[PDB]
Amino acid sequence: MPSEDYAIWYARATIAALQAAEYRLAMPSASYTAWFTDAVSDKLDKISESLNTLVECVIDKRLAVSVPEPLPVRVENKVQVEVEDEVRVRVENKVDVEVKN
């Protein structure tokens, strides 16, 4: 029943108005926030929980770590030592001696 001329103008004028305006979001519906919680927020909570588990290892601005024990090592240098016991020895060569008695 609306004339074609009016119907044409209505569609064109309504599209022009919709595009001229800007849209202020309200609080979303519960259906949107449920979706968004699954798509984003719950995943952020899991990421934050995992990060926290790692950061609880930080003490005094150092990350506490654990290594196998005892830790296998190779000493690469010549070490100065102090011998604490009397040592049993086997003399292997013929020794020059000065008799003092």
Q: According to CB under 8 A, which residues from 32 to 91 bind a copy of itself?
A: 32-37, 39-41, 43-48, 50-91
C-alpha–C-alpha distance, residues 9 and 15, integer Å: 10
Whether residue 91 contacts residue 97, with contact meaning beta carbons closer than 8 Å, is answered with no
C-alpha–C-alpha distance, residues 7 and 5, integer Å: 6
State which of positions 8-37 bind a copy of itself (CB under 8 A).
8-11, 13-29, 31-37
How many chain residues touch a copy of itself (CB under 8 A)?
96
Residue with tokens 């150092």: 62
> What's the min distance (Å) between Cβ of 7 and a copy of itself?
6
Residue with tokens 């040592």: 87
> What's the min distance (Å) between Cβ of 30 and a copy of itself?
9
> What's the min distance (Å) between Cβ of 40 and a copy of itself?
6
Helix (H, G, I), strand (E, B) or coil at 2: coil
